[PDB]
Amino acid sequence: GPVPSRARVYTDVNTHRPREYWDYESHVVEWGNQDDYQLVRKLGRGKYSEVFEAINITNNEKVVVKILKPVKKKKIKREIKILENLRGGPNIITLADIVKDPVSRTPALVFEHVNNTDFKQLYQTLTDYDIRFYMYEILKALDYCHSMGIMHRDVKPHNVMIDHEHRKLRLIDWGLAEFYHPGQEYNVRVASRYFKGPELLVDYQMYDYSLDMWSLGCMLASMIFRKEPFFHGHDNYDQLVRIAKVLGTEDLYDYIDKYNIELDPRFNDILGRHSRKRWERFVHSENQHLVSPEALDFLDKLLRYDHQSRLTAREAMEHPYFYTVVKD
Numbered sequence: 001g002p003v004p005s006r007a008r009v010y011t012d013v014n015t016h017r018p019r020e021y022w023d024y025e026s027h028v029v030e031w032g033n034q035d036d037y038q039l040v041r042k043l044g045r046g047k048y049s050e051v052f053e054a055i056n057i058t059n060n061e062k063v064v065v066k067i068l069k070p071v072k073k074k075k076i077k078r079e080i081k082i083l084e085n086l087r088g089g090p091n092i093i094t095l096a097d098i099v100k101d102p103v104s105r106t107p108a109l110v111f112e113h114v115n116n117t118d119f120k121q122l123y124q125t126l127t128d129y130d131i132r133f134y135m136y137e138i139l140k141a142l143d144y145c146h147s148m149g150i151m152h153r154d155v156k157p158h159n160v161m162i163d164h165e166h167r168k169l170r171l172i173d174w175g176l177a178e179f180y181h182p183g184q185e186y187n188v189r190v191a192s193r194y195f196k197g198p199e200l201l202v203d204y205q206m207y208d209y210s211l212d213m214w215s216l217g218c219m220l221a222s223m224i225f226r227k228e229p230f231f232h233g234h235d236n237y238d239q240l241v242r243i244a245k246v247l248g249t250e251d252l253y254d255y256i257d258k259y260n261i262e263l264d265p266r267f268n269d270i271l272g273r274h275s276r277k278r279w280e281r282f283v284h285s286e287n288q289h290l291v292s293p294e295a296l297d298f299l300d301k302l303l304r305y306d307h308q309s310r311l312t313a314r315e316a317m318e319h320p321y322f323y324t325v326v327k328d
């Protein structure tokens with residue numbers, strides 16, 4: 001069988017929390033008044049929810065309402081409990097209220113409003129300094145939630161809301177987030193394809209916070225190289241092949257050999273043999289102003305096959321890439 005794995009940090013946070021903290025199935029929801037919120041316009045529909053701009057008529061302020069689609073009560077309670085646990089943490093979206101929607105007959109989560117410019121347009125205008133700044137802000141959120149025993153598991157541009165006017169960032173959609181418990185096996189069908197870590201793609205279930213750090217690395221690569229997404233697979237198998245064409249196949253085999261993991265035999269005909277590449281090959285005249293030796297070293301230390309080898313969020317915040325970023 002597979003070799004077991006543990007997070008190298010925050011390993012036992014939930015072990016030593018009171019049970020109430022991580023036992024979300026027993027959580028009792030405290031409901032607000034649904035009539036406080038007037039829906040204004042639909043912003044989007046995801047796989048698990050519909051999102052609306054709304055007004056809180058008790059203060060005439062903008063809010064966002066997320067009306068959950070029917071899922072098992074645990075996943076609903078999971079997201080709710082995680083949002084309440086993380087509330088007030090750095091760059092964590094603030095859950096303001098929870099109400100029962102009379103039409104959907106499901107919970108509607110009420111969030112602070114973030115006046116966001118969408119990432120396709122925003123990423124086209126970000127300067128070198130902007131990328132470092134916003135990366136540091138994301139790391140604050142990730143170190144916080146990891147330090148609180150929670151992995152996000154769906155880090156991607158869509159879930160990083162940025163108000164570029166006030167240089168404000170919020171990590172959103174905690175609907176796939178989980179509590180980390182040492183030795184627990186998790187569903188590998190998380191994250192969006194382009195941001196899935198090698199551990200998911202080789203079906204290794206005993207993963208941890210470090211999954212988010214791979215996803216963050218995929219984001220960083222897309223931003224500094226101006227290629228979104230960076231690893232552009234046509235499915236989950238091709239996704240691993242695209243990664244292997246960059247990180248190389250020998251280190252992939254070292255990874256799966258370390259954990260005594262077997263590749264899906266369907267890779268026999270598609271994987272090939274690939275050298276590891278140097279990151280400089282992705283630099284060209286239209287992205288070079290976003291690239292520095294510090295950026296490439298930082299990227300290199302996020303994008304490791306071995307989840308145990310990746311920078312932790314805290315380690316990442318110590319990286320020379322962020323020396324240029326003005327600290328508060």
Ligand SMILES: COc1cc(/C=C/C(=O)O)ccc1O
Pocket residue numbers: 043051064066093111112113114115116161172173174
């Ligand atoms: C789409 O704009 C927003 C979305 C959210 C939350 C989404 C989620 O948690 O799933 C919060 C504030 C927003 O301004």
